[PDB]
Amino acid sequence: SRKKMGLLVMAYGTPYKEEDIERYYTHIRRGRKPEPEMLQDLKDRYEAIGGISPLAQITEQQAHNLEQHLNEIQDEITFKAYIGLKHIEPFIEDAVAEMHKDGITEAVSIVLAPHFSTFSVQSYNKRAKEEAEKLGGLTITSVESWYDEPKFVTYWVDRVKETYASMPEDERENAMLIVSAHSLPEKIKEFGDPYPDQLHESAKLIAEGAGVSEYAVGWQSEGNTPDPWLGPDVQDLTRDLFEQKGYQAFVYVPVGFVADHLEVLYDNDYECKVVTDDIGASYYRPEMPNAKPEFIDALATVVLKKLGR
Ligand SMILES: [Mg+2]
Ligand SMILES: [Mg+2]
Ligand SMILES: [Mg+2]
Fold first, then answer.
1. How many CA atoms lie within 13 A of 240 on its CB side?
2. 147-288 — its CATH code?
3. Sorted alphabetically, which Pfam families does this protein's record hold?
4. Which of 36, 110, 150, 198 gets the highest tally of CB atoms within 10 A of its CB?
5. Residue 29 Cα, ligand 3 centroid: separation in angstroms?
6. Is residue 215 marked as binding?
């Protein structure tokens, strides 16, 4: 009795082993192979965060748990998950071609980044749709953003609540919550890109839900290009806020990210921690969603709402 549908889960992508660093970053750098020192530095960062093998596995687990959960919570549709990536195989186009080959004629897609941007989400969605158009006989309805799904907001609200409950009374009263996402070039403003506004809205929703009156919005992990990227960067924001008001604890919620990848494990857990240790403040960074049941149910709800179910 069920209708079969493809579930196209898209993501930035991550290397599978250390030997993939070169090609993964060359792709990210638009064809410019990292110099030897940079290649070695990257290997060192990945070693520091515990290894590469767990990275892509989280993403795989997210798509797999999402598929099974969607299949268990409703009885009209049977979903088959397909992972499509931007910077390493399986690429977005490979996944759509596989759905077509397997006989899928109808699919719903969702990107594993909650905020919409012209730079990433819009482009991922456009690519998936152009491949389906090229092949024919297959259509895709794509989720554009989901940062405002209540269940997702609640996930972070409750992790933030636990973190503040865990602090000594003196920290609890002199803490600063920093909500961030991946920085992008400021030129996206030329298109009226809502990306910045959505991150600020996530920060408002989370702080408000957790009853946090002192918070700030920051960006992290910017690429190196001659044109300016969205700021302030979390490292600078932390120091400036400390110099101006003397906060004793900083809590980082990298809401734009959904997994324990390099951006969180190194750019927050190491780079932000260097700063907090330098100023004598405590560092807190609540658990990323990863493939936990609570997150998977939030994503399932986002997908069913998009299909009017
Ligand atoms: Mg090896
Ligand atoms: Mg919306
Ligand atoms: Mg960096």
1. 11
2. 3.40.50.1400
3. Ferrochelatase
4. 110
5. 13
6. no
> Could you say which DSSP state residue 194 is in?
-
**Is 2-146+289-309's fold the same as 147-288's?**
yes
CA 158 to chain centre: 18
Quick one: resolution in A?
1.8
Query: Which amino acid, 64?
Result: H
The bound ligand whose nearest atom lies closest to the alpha carbon of 235 is 3
For 104, residues 6+ apart whose C-beta sits below 8 A from its C-beta are 4, 5, 6, 80, 138
Name the experiment that determined this structure: X-ray
Across the strands, what pairs with 251?
A: 177, 284
Ligand nearest to the backbone CA of 16: 1
CA 163 to centroid of chain Cα atoms = 21
C-alpha span between 35 and 39 (Å, rounded): 6
- Render the burial of 68-99: b for 16+ CB within 10 Å, e for the rest: ebbbeebeebebbbbbbbbbbeebbbebbbbb
